[PDB]
Every structure is written in structure tokens, then in C-alpha cells.
Amino acid sequence: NTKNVIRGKYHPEFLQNEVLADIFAHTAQTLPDKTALIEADKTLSYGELYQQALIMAQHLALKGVKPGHIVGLWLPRGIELLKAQLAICLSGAAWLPFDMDTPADRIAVCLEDAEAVGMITTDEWYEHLAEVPQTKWTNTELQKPLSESVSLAKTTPDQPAYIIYKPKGIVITQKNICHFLRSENSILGIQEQDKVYQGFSVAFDMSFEEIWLSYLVGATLWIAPKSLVSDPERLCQTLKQEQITVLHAVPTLLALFPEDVPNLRIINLGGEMCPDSLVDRWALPHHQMFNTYGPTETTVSASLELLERGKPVTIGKPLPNYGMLVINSERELLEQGETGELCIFGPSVAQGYLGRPDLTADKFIENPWAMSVEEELLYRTGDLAKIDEFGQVHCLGRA
Ligand SMILES: NCCC[C@@H](N)C(=O)O
Ligand SMILES: [Mg+2]
């Protein structure tokens, strides 16, 4: 019996024998005629999206892409970016996402580091990649008709699903991300009826909360243009105009909203702990306001907190099947109250840092207190924390 190890709810059924392609293919076959993507006035259905991405994936397979390969992704915000991400996924490979504003030299560095077999871009952007040695395919050429269908080798849960980036490549597995999706959505509860704002760059974790939760339940995505992403008041009006029901964002953006958006079902605030003033402003009755915390090394999020006016803001309790404990300099578990390094365990702990066994073995360590085979690996956040007399974890800055 120990009050110094804090777990999320027990849900072994969130650990399935699945991969991202399985989740999306299920959603697309179940709701082919449902609209999946919205870009201004263009709309694509789940069935249309699935077929187009499958054609692109067969083209990747023809060009030599197989499960376990890493494919760079660099396209403008929009339907084509998401379709290309999905095409990489359907091919069985993991994608390395690049923000719109990534300099070509950084792209080259990341592709080299990951040993990527190639990357997807557009014709317009293809010219900008002269100094990139790796193979560069255009969505256009990958969308050409095929004279015969190509069988796609399936990938395994232990294979990478994506790699998030001097550069540190964090390797997230199919297992990691599929479990994270099911775990967080058991609490958030994104529904198929929802209309979800898609404003994050695919290089950030919260883009997964936007896109792939929606894929999981078949919600509809309204993809924000680059112009809108930097205009909080124009965005505050756009959310009302399009009647978006789900918004993932960081506290500062919400704090820059002039009025309320009453038609927002769920408000998931990542990035930073929400200030009390923003809670009192937005934790309204017709709003379910959440604050999600977690390092990229444990798949998007690790804990989630339901915000309420007058309830002090904390990082919440771990997500289902996630766990948190506090250790000291000697890598040994501390009794409650005595502060130390916050560590996270569970099935969504990343594989580690790509091609850097030194640092990986330094920060991903054996868990001597695992109560199952999914808890055998602790990621040391580098944060300092303590468990209070309420079983709640409190962050206390960096080490
Ligand atoms: N919901 C989590 C917020 C995003 C944070 N994990 C990050 O590393 O960017
Ligand atoms: Mg991090």
C-alpha cells in the first residue's frame, strides 16, 4: 500500500491489437459519406479521404515505402496536408511532420537524422528543397491513377507511428498513440456529431488531439488557414460562425478572445497551466473546460484536469492507464510529500529518442515498481513535483 504512486483509471480495453490505420479505416468504412474535412468551402468525406489516401499509399508502396520506414511531411495547412499524413499512415510507415515555417536545412537535418526514405511536399514547395538529398515526392504525383491495385503491407503496434523533432527525434509507436487516443477520449468524449477546429501545425502534439480523436469517433474537421491562426478576434468570430463544438488551444489564445463562443462543447487547454482569471472567464455552465498536461515523450498528454470557477487549477489526475511517481537523485521512489523528479509510466511512454541511445537510456529507465508489463518504463520529465495530501501531483518548476 503506497500513496506515493498515482495511477489513472484502470482500462485494459484501451490497449487493443491495433494501429492508426486500423482506427481510421474503421471510421471511414463505418461512415463513408460523413464529411471528414472542411477547408473554406471545399469538403471531403471520410470515404473520399480514405480512397484518395489509399491511392497515395499504394503509390508510396510502389516507390518502396514499407512498414517501419519514416516519411517526411511538409505541406501547407489544408486538406492536402492531412490527406498526405493519412497516406503515409496507410502505407504502414511513420511520418515526420514539419511546420509550415521550417527552413530547408532543418528539414535536411531531420531527414538525415531519422534516416528517412523520403518526404512528401507540393510542386510549389518542391523547388525550395534543392539542398535536401532525400527523395522528394509530390502529393500530385502520388495521386495519379493506378493501372492495378497494390497490396499494402500492414504495420505492427511496436512500429513507429510518427517522430516529433541538436535535433531530438522522439519515437512514438502505433501502440503509444492508439492507446493515448482511446485513453484521453474516454474522458474528453469527442463525439461524431462534433465539429472540431483544426488550427494546430502538424508538428505539435495538440494537432493529434485535434485530428485523430476526430478520426477515432468520426467528427468533422474545419481546417484553419494560416491567415486565421494569428487573428484571435477573427478566430473568435469564425468559431461562432461555423458553430464549432470542439476547440483545442493554449490558454493565451483563449485569453485573447473578445467574447464568449457559447456553442463550444469541449474546450481543451494544453500547452500551459490555465490561469485562474481565464478559468473564471470561461469555466461556464455550457462549457466543459479542460487542462491537459504531458510531455511529448509520453504521447501528447499524460494528465487531464476539469476546470471549474473557484476550484484551484492543478495538472489533474493521470489519464487512464497512465501513472506518475516522484523519484530523487538516486533514481529511487520517494514517500509522499518529499519533492523530486516527476516520472511517468504506462503504455504510452515513447520508445525513446531516435538514434541517441545515450540520452534515451538516461531518461527512459527501468521501473522497479511496475505492477504490470505496461508500467516497466519510466520517463523522467526533468520537472520537479510533489504529491500532496489529496493524492494530487503539483509541479514545482524545472530541475
Ligand atoms: N496536451 C499537451 C500539450 C502539448 C505538450 N505535450 C507539448 O509538448 O507541446
Ligand atoms: Mg516535451
Numbering used by the authors: 7 to 171, 178 to 411
Quote the study on this structure.
Here, we report a δ-poly-L-ornithine synthetase from Acinetobacter baumannii, which we name PosA. Nonribosomal peptide synthetase (NRPS) enzymes, usually composed of condensation, adenylation, and thiolation domains, are involved in peptide natural product biosynthesis to produce antibiotics and siderophores.
The α-amino groups of all three substrates, L-ornithine, D-ornithine, and L-lysine, interact with of Asp217 in co-crystal structures. Density for both ornithine isomers was unambiguous; the electron density for the lysine ligand was less complete for the carboxylate and amine, suggesting the longer substrate may adopt multiple conformations in the active site of the crystallized protein. Michaelis-Menton kinetics showed a preference in the apparent kcat/KM of over 160-fold for L-ornithine compared with L-lysine. The apparent kcat/KM for D-ornithine was 250 M−1 s−1, indicating a modest preference for the L-configuration by the A. baumannii adenylation domain. All four structures were solved in the same space group P212121 with two protomers per asymmetric unit.
